[PDB]
Structure 1
């Protein structure tokens, strides 16, 4: 319809989403898109906060969209679009920066774009009257700024911006690195060794799961605190399977960590193959992906430009 409005975005900063993106974010999107009016964005403007190769950035914009479909985003149920194609984001970003404290952006955990991108992220969400933002844990402080500036703006102009609720999971809120269970799996960690990429060679990812840092307790128990690597593997295995962790952990009574890494690599391999097949097709036959993105952008402009003119009108701009 047009309510329970959802918005979330991933950066085209690499040739593959990793498990963090797919289980911590896109999995939530897939569950939600059924009864939520959803907008899913490849946020290429954010990518260039860091220097980007032009050939790769265009390639990765499509590859990221396609991974959205290969994870189950349904272009009949949701809108996929590329951020740079909707001018409203930057328009709203300028306005919102005028309502963002300098210290407020300083305290976010060097270029101007590196300093202001949380404001652009704020405009990304608020531009679509978003009710709910499915993100992982690391995007939380960002979206608390987005809500503060929305309330800051609404106090001067009541009823203009929707204040969004932050919808972040529990299990999957942070998929940690496999060699470094203290850090989150992310695209700039130096080693893809702890990095499980959706589109990597499934036997390569399986070999990283086998080399996952565990403890010595010889006990398969879910405690993210003291058993980081081990709780990660179960977190991962539970997410790619649909099986609750407790039902796994009890099934792992008597088992050691070898059986744990085997089953998790078993399941990740069976997870990523249907994805890689879908992604391959979409890259070799781009007609579909570009039709989706083209309809996506027109629908996004239809919504986001109306928000911008409402904000502009409230500010006193001549329309």
Structure 2
């Protein structure tokens, strides 16, 4: 079994290297010997105002990038969150076991609730960590492969599951968090100590999978480095250079230490071009797959339709189990 669950929001027209290397690469490695549910979490997207035409299109292109990155619909379940009602059913129950102060200590919330503490925060922006917990717990998930930015959220999920099981033993699976080391955080290229996010202002440090490959290669060349002319791996001291080697290692397969000793005598310029070529060679097979999946959508549609059918059969059994323990009339 070794049941796995993970999700990405359809908040943009393309994943970036952080999503692909910090999350989806780990999924592709897991799917062959784990029972895997990979979700496009469109209910999370609407915590921020969303254009309806874009939201539907980005939902499909997020699932398409899953397949383009190697997710295999014969080995794994891909589905759209909003199509499985159990997620919200479980999230209401779990919110009843979640401390108010526990939810207000979440970092995302204190960011937006900093400049406009009550003026611009919504309830959804306050409670989405509880819906994230329900996303995982509805599938009896044993392991959750995520980047480091999701760690605090999933500690909340584990705590609420243990609190619930304290009242009702053996109802929910408490999941283990699986965060990588090298690819745990792909950083911005114009700002080496800040996390590559879709909401970065200027995308000149952002590397989108479906962007024009020559533009992404132009951004890699413009990456902020240091001034030591020494190519080595020290992220605390060398944020830029360690990022680029981390990227090149991830898109190729070559260990960082092997890369570093090969870069003995080499300069940052050759490290940039080399990374730029590996990335261009990485994104080009993806863009061609996405373009076929976008142009011919009966294949993608059908994967998502089988996926939601399978996800509903699992997740609704969990809800019915939780409801029976709570004492609801069934």
TM-score normalised according to structure 2 size:
0.96
**Displacement, 1:55?**
0.1
**Displacement, 1:215?**
0.4
**Displacement, 1:9?**
0.1
**Displacement, 1:200?**
0.1
**Displacement, 1:309?**
0.2
Runs of 4+ with >6 A deviation: none
**Displacement, 1:52?**
0.3
Residues 1:238 and 2:249 are matched in the alignment: yes
Structure 2 residue ranges without an equivalent (≥5): 108-120
Q: Tell me the alpha carbon deviations over residues 4-51 of structure 1, each in whole angstroms, 9 at most, x when there is no partner.
A: 000000000000000000000000000000000000000000000000
Alignment counterpart, residue 266 of structure 1, candidates 256, 274, 277: 277
**Displacement, 1:258?**
0.3
**Displacement, 1:130?**
0.2
Q: SS at the partner of 2:37?
A: strand
How many Å separate the matches in 1 of 2:277 and 2:74?
Answer: 32
Q: Tell me the alpha carbon deviations over residues 49-70 of structure 1, each in whole angstroms, 9 at most, x when there is no partner.
A: 0000000000000000000000
How many Å separate the matches in 1 of 2:71 and 2:64?
Answer: 9
Counting matched residue pairs gives 317
The 5 Å alignment of 1:272-311 reads 272-311=283-322
Cα RMSD (Å): 0.3
How many Å separate the matches in 1 of 2:203 and 2:96?
Answer: 39
**Displacement, 1:174?**
0.2
How many Å separate the matches in 2 of 1:192 and 1:288?
Answer: 32
Q: SS at the partner of 1:9?
A: strand
Q: SS at the partner of 1:318?
A: coil
Q: Tell me the alpha carbon deviations over residues 119-156 of structure 1, each in whole angstroms, 9 at most, x when there is no partner.
A: 00000000000000000000000000000000010000
Q: Tell me the alpha carbon deviations over residues 75-96 of structure 1, each in whole angstroms, 9 at most, x when there is no partner.
A: 0000000000000000000000
Q: SS at the partner of 2:286?
A: helix
**Displacement, 1:192?**
0.8
Alignment counterpart, residue 27 of structure 2, candidates 19, 26, 29: 29
Structure 1 residue ranges without an equivalent (≥5): none
